[PDB]
């Protein structure tokens, strides 16, 4: 693995103190769309002193962390890993979580009760 962190122009502080995270974005519980859940995002863990603080004056969110808004998209997981250790970065990788396939029937809703009903559907 060639070490490109000396020829990128990035400081040594970023490659030696900052840990970064590769993750695939979760499907939102809000809406039924799944489009932003395919690319692998690369995202920096926050610094606890440098993350954000409110201003004296008006209360603007001021920051000294500069990688807080940078976020990368990759097609592949191995793309993100190859780029991340090619730039010499400490990374954690988060495995995705898909839904378990369960067979659904509409005729499931009204099957015959032999004993206690134990449920009342509505529709």
């Amino acid at each position: 693995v060639p070490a490109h962190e000396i020829v990128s122009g990035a400081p040594a502080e970023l490659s030696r103190n900052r840990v970064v995270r590769i993750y695939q974005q979760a499907k939102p519980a809000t809406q039924s769309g799944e489009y932003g859940t395919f690319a692998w995002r690369l995202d920096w863990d926050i610094v606890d002193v440098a993350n954000r603080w409110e201003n004296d004056l008006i209360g603007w969110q001021s920051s000294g962390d500069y990688m807080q808004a940078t976020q990368m998209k990759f097609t592949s997981k191995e793309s993100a890993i190859k780029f991340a250790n090619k730039q010499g970065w400490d990374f954690y990788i988060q495995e995705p979580h898909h839904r378990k396939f369960r067979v659904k029937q509409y005729a499931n809703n009204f099957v015959h009760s032999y004993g206690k009903l134990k449920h009342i559907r509505t529709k």
Partner: protein, 209 residues
């Protein structure tokens, strides 16, 4: 134990007796919907997932049509795009102009599907206008603004099935159907802040937020 069919030219194998919407999700085909959910029962209320099926006269609801062998499914039919625009325009007629004040601005299912599948303009311009639904105080955790409900039954199906709190329901006919406790009864359950991520429109929403 499995069934092989064709959606959009794609050939897909799925376990027997499943839903056509599960076949479409397995094949990667995006089908829009409003009253289907993985952890809930199947209802055919919202009429959004209509789909072109060979050996069927009418477009069938993809969430309650079961999977059969030798099946040829098309989603890009001119009839299907017309049906999606029709059902969208039907949904939008009585839904109030609350998008600057609704809490689901960039998170409304109705709104993001109205760009992708719905009509450009609107023909709803009567003098009599939209209906209006009375606000219903449920509890201190759930803010409830029911003019913008689409009657997807999803909250009712959930609090029936999983939460075990049968106090929700649908009382009325026609446009005078409402979704709430009929007596103005407070809803308890141990997970009652979960119905507000579940409603696709902002009718049930977060009270401290």
């Amino acid at each position: 134990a499995e069934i092989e069919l064709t959606i959009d030219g794609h050939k897909v194998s799925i376990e027997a007796g499943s839903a056509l919407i599960q076949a479409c999700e397995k094949a990667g085909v995006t089908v829009p919907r409003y009253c289907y959910h993985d952890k809930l029962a199947i209802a055919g209320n919202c009429r959004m997932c209509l789909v072109d099926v060979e050996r069927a006269p009418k477009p069938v609801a993809s969430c309650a049509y079961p999977v059969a062998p030798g099946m040829v499914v098309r989603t890009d039919t001119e009839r299907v795009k017309q049906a999606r625009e029709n059902v969208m325009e039907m949904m939008l007629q009585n839904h109030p102009l609350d998008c600057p004040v609704c809490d689901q601005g960039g998170e409304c299912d109705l709104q993001d599907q109205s760009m992708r599948y719905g009509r450009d303009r609107g023909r709803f311009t009567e003098i009599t206008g939209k209906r209006s639904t009375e606000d219903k105080n449920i509890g201190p955790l759930v803010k409830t603004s029911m003019n913008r409900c689409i009657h997807c039954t999803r909250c009712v199906r959930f609090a029936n099935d999983i939460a075990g709190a049968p106090e929700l329901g649908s009382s009325g006919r026609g446009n005078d159907m409402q979704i709430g406790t009929y007596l103005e009864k407070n809803l308890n359950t141990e997970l009652s802040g979960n119905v507000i991520d579940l409603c696709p429109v902002g009718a049930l929403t977060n009270k401290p937020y």
